[PDB]
Every structure is written in C-alpha cells, then in structure tokens.
C-alpha cells in the first residue's frame, strides 16, 4: 500500500515546482506516484485501486469536486491538500468524514512534507486494521522470542532441509514467522479469551451484529457441534432440518439426543426448498413429539438458512413463532447478511433479543467471505453460561490454534466493517444481478435454446425476491407467502429438458454435459442437479469472471449446434473412455441421456422418495454405538427393505440426505428404494456419469450394497 | 534451491575457460555459483546451507575425495563431474548413491551443459519433494479454475479491500493461491483418502514405521478424540493416564465411559515419572475393574508417552503385559523417535505388529518436528474397521481443510525421510547432550552455586539413559528397572534450593526468577516447576540459540551475585508493580519465595496431593452432563470436602490435573484441598507470582470458589 | 552512529561469503563497514571512535582475545559472534558484562542478520540515552502538536523571514524542534519535577553521589542564590 495520486496541472510555477520535489522525495520514501487527468480519473482510480493510500491535490480547485465523493468511497483515505491564501471550508463538507492534511506550496518543504505523508500513511493503516491483526504483524516484524512452540521456530528448522528450503521459499517468512503460539503473550490466547483475541471477538460482534462471537479454527462443521453439544443435553429432543449437512448428522451420531425432523419442500428440478410454516407451529411439533418414542418436548432446533441454493427463510416468523428456547441457524452460505439492508429480517442475528431464546448462527467465513479455510464463527444472540460455553468451544477447540486462520477471520471481519463492506457486498449483488439480466437478455436475443436463470419474471428490483404462491417460476406446490426469499447472488442456471409444471420435454441437455464443458474451460461448477448448475457470485467473483462465465456458455451453446465430436469437444471425458466417445457427437451424448432420465422418470422418482421418510427405529447415536461394537454387515441395495441402516445415504442427485443412521425403509418408504434403484441403473450406461451414493458401493459385479446393522 | 558449487583452480587454460563460460551461462539462468576453496571448504557450504543443489568438479581430481562424503551427507545432491580422457570409476563407488552426470571440457558447451544442469536441478527438486505438495506447488504455479471455494479465490478478493490488500501483501502470493479446496480435482480428498493425498498417507507411514496413518489439521486434541472414540464405544472402560492432556479429559467428557486411572510416580521436585509396572499387570486392573462400579474389563487404555519432562517407557513391556485390544500413545511430545535408533523399544510404533492388538500413536507434528500449527498424526499398527475409523475420522475433521496445514504435515515427513531426517534427529541429540555437558562443565568450574541437570552421572553415551533404582539422580523411589529411559533433548535444569534426599536447602533460588530473567532476554521456558526449568532441544535450535540460552543462565548468575535491583534486572516485574519492587534487589527477592516455599512445606504438600485420588462418585460425561443441565454452583475453596466437583482443576505447580470432574474430596483425600489452599495462600504475597490454579476462580475479597454440583 | 568493524580474514569460503554478503546487506541499511587488521587495530578502533556501535567476528578465533577488553572499554557494545559446531563459552567470560549475539555462517541469510543487527543497534542506543533525552528526540522525530509556545513553533515562523531562514539554516530543524514547552505532556515539567525530569533528576543524583539533584538553566549564579536563599532566613548570619 503505497500509491499515492497527484491530482493536477496548474500552470504557476509557484504551485508546480514543489509538486514535484514532492512527486521526488515521496519516491525516495518508496511511494509509487500516480496521476490521474482529473476528477472522474482519480474516482476510478480509488474504485479499482485497493493500494491508493493517499490523494495529493490543490484544495481550492478540487475541493467541492472530490470530498463527497472521496468519502462515499473511503473514509478514511489520507487527503493531502495544498492551501491557498484565500483556502476556505464550505458548509457541504461538516457532515463529511474525511481525513484532510494541509500543506503549503513552498520549496525545500519535500522531506517534511513525505515525511507527514509516510507517518500519516502509517496511522491510516493501524486505523484499519483490526487488533490481532496489527499485533500478529508487530510481532512477525518485531519480536524475538526463541525456544518456544512450534518446532520449526519461524520457520528455521525447515531451511536445515532442502525440501523444508523449497517449502520455506514458497510460503515465504511472514507465513512461517505468523506460526506462533501462546508464547507469544503480547497477543493473548483464543482459548482464554485474552488480550487482542478478547479485542478480537468484540470487534468481532460489532461488526456482525452479535451479542457473542467465537471464532472456530475447524470449521462450521466444529461450530455446528460446539453449539449443539452445549444446547443439546444427552437424552433430550432437537427440531433438526432434514436439509442438513453432514456435520450435523456426525452431532447426532456422537451425542445421545433423539432427533425429530423438520420436513423441506422441494421442485420438478430437486431444488430444496424451505420448512413449511405449519412445521413450526406448536401443535404440529407436540404430534411429532408424541408419536416418536422417548421424545419429550425440543430444546434446541437447527434451520439451515439459507438452502444451499440460496432461498432465505423468514427468520422473524421462525423467532415469534417457533417455541424452542434454542434456536440455531447454519449460515454456512450467507456469512453477509449483515452488510445489505436487502437481507434485514431473513438472517438469524437480524434485529434485536428475542426473549426467552437464544440465536445462534455458524458462518463458515472462508466459504464466501475472504478468510482461510477452516475459518468460521459462532455468533450468539442471547444469553447462554459462559462458562459451560467455554468449555463446550475448549472440548472441539485445539490448544495450539493456527494463528493465520485466526487473523484471516478477524480481517474479513475488517474487509466486512461499515461502508467499505456495503459497498463490496452491494458490488456482489449488482454483478449477481447484472449476470441474470444478461442471461435474460441473451435468451430472448439468441435463436433457438439457450439457459434460463431461476429467478421470477421480473427482477426489475435489487431485493431478496419473495416466493409468491401465486406465480409458478420457483416450481414449489402451495408456499407460504412472505415466507421465502431469493438470494440474489445465488444464481441457478436452468438448461432445456423440463417444462414448468413438471413434464419433461423432448429436447433436453443435461447440466453435467454443461458442467463438464465449464470444467473443460475452467469454470467449477458449485452444484449441478439434473437440469441446474449453481453459481455463487461471491465477492471474489469479479467482472471479468462473470464475462468468462457468460462467453463459455455462449460458446457451449454454439459448439452443442455446431454438434462437435466428443473428442474434441469434452477431450477429459473422451479420456474416461476413448473407444466409447470415439465417434460419438455432443447432440447425440445429449439426447441420450436426456432420453435416459425421461424413461426412468428421474424427477418423479426423486420427488417421491424424498417426499416421505423412512422408520427411526433407533436414533443416529444407537446406530453409531451399534457400528462401534463391530454389528454391521453389508447387504446387496435390493435387500435393504426392513433392514436397519448403519450408514447415511446420501444421493446425488438432489445431494440432500435420504436415509439416516438407525433408519428403515418399509413399504411405506419404498420410493426411497426405488430412487437408488433407478440411480444406480441410470448410472451404468455412459463413462463419466457414473452413480454418485455416499453410502453406497459398487461391487464387482455391477451391483450395490449398503451396510446395515445386523439382527 | 539455486546454489551450485564450483570446486576447483586448474591450472590449464583448456578446463578453466569453459567453467569461467558455464559460470557465466548458470548465472544468466538465474544459479548463485559458489566458490569452495577445497574439499572441507565444500563440506562445510553443504552442511551449512541447504539450498545448495550442484557441486561442480574435475572428476580426477576430486572423485575419491568427495564422493563418499556426499553421499553420507545428501544421498540425492546432484553431481557435476567433468570428465577427462583416462577417467574411470573406482569400485569404492559401488555401493554409493549418487546422482553424477558427466560433463567435457569444451569451449562454446556452456549453454547445453547449463540446461542440463536446470534439467537436473529440476530432477532433483522433484525427487524430494513428497507427492501431494509437489501438486499443491505445481497447481499454485500452473492451474486456473474459477468459480471455486474459498470465496478469496486465490486472494483476489484480498484484493479489492485495503486492509485485504495489507493482508495480501502480508502473506503473498503462494499462501493465498495454496488456499484451495476438492474443486481441484488433481489433489484428490482428504477425506476420501483419495488422490495425492492416499499417496501422502501411504508415504507418512512408510516414513514413520505404521500400518497406517492419517493427517489430522485440528491437533493432536483432534487426534486423541478420533481414536479414543473409535476405541471406546459407550459404557465401555478405559484404562488412562492421570498424567493426560485435557484433550483426552475432553474425550471423556464428551463420551459415556467409565475412567480407570493409571497413577503415575513422582519425585520431590514434582517431576512426574512413569507408571509402574505393577500398573500394568492383570491382577491390579482386574482388582481396579471390581473397586470401581460399572466398569467391565477395560477396552482402550491410554499412556502418554513420553511424559512432558521428558521420560520414555518401555513400549515392549506395555505391549507384551497390558491385556488391553487397544492401546494408544499419546506421542506428542515424541514424533521423533522413528529417526534415530535411541529410541528402538521405547515408542509405540517400535517393532513390529502386537498380535490380539491395535497400536495407536498420535503426534503433534507442529510440536518439536517443522509443520504448521494443527497439524497432526494418527498412526495405526495393527488391524482397524477402516470405515468405522473413516467415519470417526470424518465426525471430527472439517469438510475443509487447510491444505497448508496438510502439506506442511506430509513435508514433515519428507524431511525426516531417510538419512537427512537422522542426520537432523542425530544432530538435536548432539546438541542436547554438548548443553548438558556444557552446564555440567560451567558448574566444576564456577565458583558458589550453579545450575545442575536432571541427567545421570555420567552421560558418557549418546543412548537413552536408563533409570535404575541404584542411582538417586532422578528422585523416583522403588522404580523398577529397565522400566524409564531419559530422553536426551528433554533438558531439565535445576535452580538450587532443594536438595538430592527431598529436603529443602537454606540457599535457593527459584526457577520463576529464572524463567522472569529468560523471559526479559526473549527466551521462553516450556515449563517451569518449583526448581526446575524445562529446555526442549528440538531440530529448531541451533548452536546459536543454545549459546544463547548458555550465555543467559551464566548472566543471570552474575546479575544475581552482583545483587541487582529487581527494577533493572526484571523490568516487566517491576512494570507489574513499581511500588512494590521500587527498592528490592534480587537476592532479597529471591530469599523470601525461597522461604514462602520452605515454609508452606511446597514440596512434601504437592507430593502427597498427588499421591492420593479424589473418589470418583460420577464420570466426567455425567458430571458434564448435570453442568450442561445448570446443576453447577460456585462455592468457596474451604468448602470443597464432600461436593462433587463439576470442573477438572489442575493447577501450577505441577500442571497435571489434580481432581476430574464427578471426583469428590473426601476425608481420604484432604491432602488434595490441603495443598490447593497452600498454593492460594503463597500466591497473595508478591505481585507477578500470583496463584495458578486452572479451575479455581479469585474472588474480589481473595478467596477462591470452585464450581461444584448441586446437591 | 552507525559503524560497524568486521573483524577477520578466514582463507574458507564459506565462512567468508557470508559476511561479503552481511557487508553488504549492512551498506543497504546505511551503515559503515570498517575492516581493522587484527585485535589491537579493533581496539583502537574503539578507543578512537565513539560511534563505532558493533563488533562481527569469528567466535572461536577471537572470544578469548576480544571480550575482556572490550567489556573494559565499552561494556554495553553490541557484539556479533559467528558460532561454529564447536563454539563453546569459556570460564572466563562469566564475570563480563557483555552484550553477544550468536550467528551463523549461512548463504541467504544476510538480509535478516543485517535487521537484526539494526535492531540490535537500536536497542544500545536506547539503552545509553538517559531517558528526557531519549523522550525529547523522540518527540522532535515523531511527535506533531500545534498550537502551541513558543511562538516559532519548532522553526514555523523563522521560515517565513528571510534574516529567520538563515537563522534556521544555521543552527538547523533539530534545534528548532527542540525548542518545545510544557504544552508537550510526554516530557513533563521541569517546575513540577514530574515526568521524565522526575526520571532525570534521579538519574543524576545516581550518577553524582547525592541525596537530591536539581537541574538549573541559569547557572551556578542562580543554584548559588536559590541555595542561599533557602538556607540563610533574613536577619541571619
């Protein structure tokens, strides 16, 4: 961060020689001097320029001009502006923050003048960078101790090494010096919850809107299991969201709860959608209650908001209505709730206390904040014992944190504070939504097919898109209305194959075909269903990355028309099976999976199974303690009816959960069957498209087995 | 890695002007050539510098002087012999590997002979690095998938914030780039164990003698976790060390088993020693397993070995008595002991496969090897559920793992593999055993008092040093022999102030003065008891740091002799509390702890708390279970007899827990109370030597509360 | 302050191109290198130049030749010790007061060893400045107040006149901006004995063997008349 913008041409020489001594003396400081041509320039500049630090300029000349704008900006960007005689302040620029340094146009004033410029420099960049950040970087820069934890000691005992050299040079000293541990006690301990850490988890709140935040150094997957072991005592009952993740089945598997499920509605597509509101209604959970065994009433629930493909929930509704003490939402997908006010009342800290509950809400901040990975939060609104939250955080915490990912939570919380967070949030969602409009535009503009985005007829609004009952775009039978809202930058593309009402069609390109091309070009594909592709437009997704996006799915179309060969066109795929993909084209690959899922009736199939659920003969952790003992046995897929399952099942597609440790599939759950039949049958045919069932083998033969527990 | 050696001066115009043309070439491809006066000139730039990755040399003149050198020193270091007209190969060669390509002295060569030699060097850096590293490395420099998780992208989200930017230009490039996720495809999964990172694991164990291994990136406490709940289903009984990291307490808090405690001996100093033999035998567990209720024959036992000062078992003895299916090391302290054959017999994964049992070793590799923080080792030998353990494995791993942390782990073991890693190994060891004949030497030959070592009489052998019960050095009484064995880079200094039989001299000095001195010359003690001072010789320090720490202990002897005020001499002592320490020297200072230790009756009060146990009325996961549920008070210290306690209280001295949680004080076990108030009466005195008692809470009148159930 | 005596000549390369590249890894800090022959040439080196701030040599070849005599002359002179496998400290250095760091002979490593040899160089600095001239440098290199006597306001307004332009030429800007007032509250006061006059005042006494020190600005006339006048009441004798 040393770029500093010099804004003029005077024409005196009065003004122009110290400007230049100026432009000198701060590149003997190590200043990169830039200069823009005027206003507009200067605001480009600062809009795609993160390392300007610091705008020289003639105050009466630019005053007016760039103050407001510069403070709509950055805050707190250092302005150095050279007076005149008659210099004034006029009344627009009270309401303004800005950080303004005078100075005069007088020669031999250059060393004095870089000088305040580099020591203002350096206040700017203590100002915003948040407290165990600016400490952890004190002390790679300062400190000195030795004999002390980890081994390698900043990074010395790798150069010993020759690979441990390679290892070093790639990383670089900062990241091997970072590498301390409570040592160092000039930076505290994430464990007690001292010193800059301590100034961490509050700076942490206030910028998240949370009473409470822990940073969790294992992921959400550890935060799911820290809030759901301090809120779930052993023999108690949780409300859990059918759409969970996997974390949250392993919480059930180590803990003793009994678990009672909240139901999701879906579409023709196998997009999820949310729990239903007669699902939170007292006297539908007191019916669940009451035919499960050994169920008394919830004392925790989990929601996970938003789905994973990006539909928000109604969160207030969930706070005045759900009866639960505990109320936990996994936020895995939405850590930037906070920072848009299109998000207000659709995130589980929006608003105030809830009386009489506790919120919780995990973030996994590296999922689509800037953090490294296995960074997430734990934010807290309400009141819990402190205690006893301590020790839960200490029993999935380690004792020797790694202090980057600690540093790397706490700087998006500082990329994420005040106006500079709105507007990289705000940037986020006009792309998302500039993208949609894009796509709409070159569907109706193109000839024949092209893509579709999953978003209603008109998005002519920057908002979270309500689902309304009376309009058939989201595909889901009977919603709630102002009940579920559309994440704008959640985008799902939609390729032909289906009609809206359900009914395939008779042209149709499945979205792996689609996927595998965007692989082919580069582009990873979040989620692929059988006729969606998700993407999320995260703020590392820029301009440039939504235009590649855009031209590789103009391109698919036209090299799917041209009808390329295989070889050509997927040359990994032709790779899976080069004498099967020797001859064949992409229109007839197309057509024949299309035709393969129309016969099979994937989409009803799917509906089917996941629209009923199988027997809890015993709960996750029974079936856990029961594998534990060594009582499993693996039985072929057809023969799993009445039968006991050991392991989760879970398909792809929808890539939800089907069947859970300890769960039976009976007559009445027989469409569960029937979809990992129909699954594993559809999967046999092409190289590459092979069935996808965590849960599932493939044996020999061709056939699958699941494991289920003995009887 | 681009330093090549050039060895020699001819004297013929014919050799020396094409070297003077392939020094010119190897520099315009970016090599640091390196200038050997002769051969021990050469054997010190290798020994000293490891980024040195050619030796150029007239083979005639040099061959039998070199190559047998190298090859001891750097089996893969790549060999550059100009060759002449009657050179030949000497049958001393044979049996040594080397990497040798043969060169001609040719004018106008030096261009193809420089690209052979980037070719080798090439060669040679991808034969040293580890699998899934040389992949991490190739994608960072070469790959470009967008779209991805982490949402920074490869920190190009850093980017677009200032304070992002800081923490860009902070870490660089690689860091941010090496921060990926299963969306690369080429590096496989960690939790599929698939790809380069099946590779990774297969290598880890070839390198560490296991049947098995598996990276863990959220520690050792992780670690302890994953095997103690794959080894000890619900209501089974575990056989555990008392002297056990509080993640393995953790394990027991979160799992329904019932605790049998290994006791563990001490000597005066509160060293704790290793369990006896008798421990070991079946009729004490079987008479254990009928005392305690609800206990069946223990499944699981848990052993840390080597205890944390240093003291390693013999594992031979444990695997042939112990009649447990499963027993686990906690190695953190040890992941060394593969690479040097002092330690054969003395850690787990020692020998062979136990029949009728499974052997498991966790380890820190971030502790005493160069990893990054978290990471950490299972290793496995003997026969497992591969799917249970995968799926234990996966309830406590991150669907996201930093794969800095992975790397960092498998490159550990690229660093301890083969000769290089026991080249490494051995040189900590003699490091550690020139600073203990260096304080022995500096003791004969000083005048008045001086540091002594816990070490043997006469440590004359680079081996282990066995315990026996003839020799009185270690303060252990009745212990068995061929039973402990000292490890040698575990040094424990003694301040003076007690003496050989367990009582207390009239001179002394302790080791918290000593540890504050440390502390104000950057040196950081790993522990410090009462007369002792923990000093850990891992691969990190180097001779520079152990004159260091040398030069230290002999100026706090003179800063001592020369009675220096506590306000020059202790300077954050003095900031703790100036009015305090306005006016005291360091004798003084040092003669009044010396004498609230001998007073309180430190030494024998700490031994007999811990040789007596708290009853266990409840197990710690009921006793967490009823805190979980509110059932928790705070009462006063005094009052602690006859309630059941809620937290584990450990406290400082010694640091090993002291009461479990659902343990209750009884009138059998007053000694136990008797020295917590001890330690809460001598910490009143002096500011800076306050009371350290994890579990008890001060209270604004000065007393101390515990946390104990309701009743 | 910013000379520092290389001493030595080894005859093995990789001893010696490490210490060409701290040479000149030192030089890119701004520092001057200085080369004495042997150990009688270092110390009159030392005894001739006071800003001569730190000695590098080979531990083995000169500990016993070196320590003893420079703690004589200069106890608080950073030296730079390169250790080998079989450095050792000996007996006889138990007794000196001596500040050492310990180094190694590695390719690469010039960058870091020249930081901390800043660092180090910093830290003698700070240590031999008595602590309100440690306070008052540090205000006129850092501190910014305003508004503030006396009225040049650290050579402000001698800039705005020609005849005050040489005078501000001359005596120069440190000069200047340490003439400050009590208006910066980080020195203290000397009226009010408080801060690091306070500091100051101690300091002196420990140096000069008195109970009590008093710092005057006008003089032994003046400290003559304010003893006087507190030890001789009217009418005595």
Same mark, same amino acid.
């Given at each position: ?154 990074? =010395? ?230 205690? =006893? ?276 599939? =009976? ?37 699958? =087995? ?6």
């Amino acid at each position: 961060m040393n770029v500093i913008a010099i804004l003029n041409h005077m024409g005196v020489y009065f003004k122009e020689e110290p400007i230049r001594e100026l432009h000198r003396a701060l590149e003997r400081l190590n200043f990169q001097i830039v200069y823009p041509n005027d206003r507009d320039d200067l605001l480009k500049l600062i809009e795609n320029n993160a390392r300007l630090c610091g705008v020289i300029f003639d105050w009466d000349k630019y005053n007016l001009e760039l103050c407001e704008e510069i403070s709509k900006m950055n805050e707190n960007l250092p302005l150095y502006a050279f007076a005149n005689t008659y210099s004034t302040l006029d009344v627009s620029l009270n309401d303004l923050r800005l950080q303004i340094s005078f100075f005069e146009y007088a020669l031999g004033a250059a060393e004095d003048i870089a000088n305040k410029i580099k020591q203002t420099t350096d206040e700017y960049i203590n100002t915003i960078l948040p407290p165990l950040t600016k400490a952890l970087f004190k002390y790679v820069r300062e400190g000195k101790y030795t004999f002390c934890t980890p081994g390698h000691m900043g990074g =010395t005992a790798f150069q010993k090494s020759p690979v441990g050299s390679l290892f070093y040079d790639f990383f670089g000293p900062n990241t091997m010096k970072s590498d301390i541990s409570i040592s160092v006690s000039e930076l505290g301990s994430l464990l007690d919850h001292s010193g800059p850490h301590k100034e961490a988890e509050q700076y942490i709140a206030r910028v998240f809107n949370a009473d409470r935040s822990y940073m969790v150094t294992n992921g959400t997957s550890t935060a799911n299991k820290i809030v759901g072991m301090y809120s779930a005592p052993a023999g108690s009952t949780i409300l859990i969201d059918r759409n969970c993740h996997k974390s949250l089945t392993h919480l059930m598997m180590m803990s003793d709860v009994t678990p009672i499920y909240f139901r999701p509605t879906r579409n023709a597509y196998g997009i999820l959608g949310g729990i239903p509101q007669s699902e939170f209604q007292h006297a539908t959970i007191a019916k669940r209650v009451k035919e499960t065994p050994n169920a008394t009433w919830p004392v925790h629930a989990v929601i996970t908001n938003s789905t994973y493909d990006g539909l928000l929930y109604n969160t207030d509704f969930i706070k005045k209505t759900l009866d639960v003490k505990s109320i936990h939402f996994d936020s895995a997908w939405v850590p930037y709730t906070n920072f848009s006010p299109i998000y207000e009342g659709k995130c589980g800290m929006s608003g105030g206390r809830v009386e009489g509950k506790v919120i919780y809400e995990t973030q996994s901040t590296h999922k689509l904040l800037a953090a490294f990975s296995q960074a997430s939060m734990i934010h807290v609104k309400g009141d819990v014992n402190e205690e =006893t939250f301590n020790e839960a955080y200490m029993m999935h915490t380690t004792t020797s944190p790694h202090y980057g990912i600690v540093a790397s939570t706490e700087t998006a919380a500082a990329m994420m504070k005040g106006n500079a967070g709105k507007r990289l949030i705000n940037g986020s969602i006009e792309r998302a939504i500039k993208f949609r409009k894009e796509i709409k535009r070159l569907r109706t503009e193109s000839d024949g097919w092209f893509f579709d985005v999953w978003q209603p007829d008109h998005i002519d609004t920057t908002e979270c898109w309500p689902l309304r009952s009376d309009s058939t775009w989201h595909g889901f039978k009977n919603i709630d209305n102002e009940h579920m809202y559309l994440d704008p930058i959640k985008v799902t593309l939609l390729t032909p194959g289906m009609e809206k009402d359900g009914t395939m069609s008779d042209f149709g390109i499945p979205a792996s075909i689609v996927a595998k091309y965007l692989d082919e070009h580069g582009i990873v594909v979040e989620k692929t269903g059988p006729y969606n592709l998700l993407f999320l437009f995260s703020i590392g997704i820029d301009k440039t990355k939504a235009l590649s996006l855009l031209r590789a799915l103009t391109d698919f179309k036209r090299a799917f028309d041209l009808n390329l060969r295989v070889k050509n066109m997927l040359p990994s795929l032709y790779r899976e099976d080069p004498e099967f993909y020797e001859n064949m084209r992409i229109q007839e690959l197309a057509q024949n999976i299309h035709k393969l899922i129309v016969h099979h009736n994937l989409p009803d199939l799917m509906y089917r199974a996941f629209e009923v659920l199988p027997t809890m003969v015993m709960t996750p952790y029974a079936a856990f303690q029961k594998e534990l003992h060594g009582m499993t046995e693996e039985v072929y897929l057809d023969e799993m009816v009445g039968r006991i399952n050991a392991n989760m099942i879970l398909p792809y597609p929808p890539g939800v959960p089907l069947v859970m440790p300890g769960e039976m599939i =009976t007559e009445e759950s027989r469409p569960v069957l029937e979809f990992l039949q129909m699954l594993c049958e559809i999967g046999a045919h092409y190289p590459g498209f092979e069935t996808d069932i965590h849960g599932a083998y493939r044996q020999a033969d061709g056939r699958y =087995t699941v494991k289920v527990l003995k009887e």
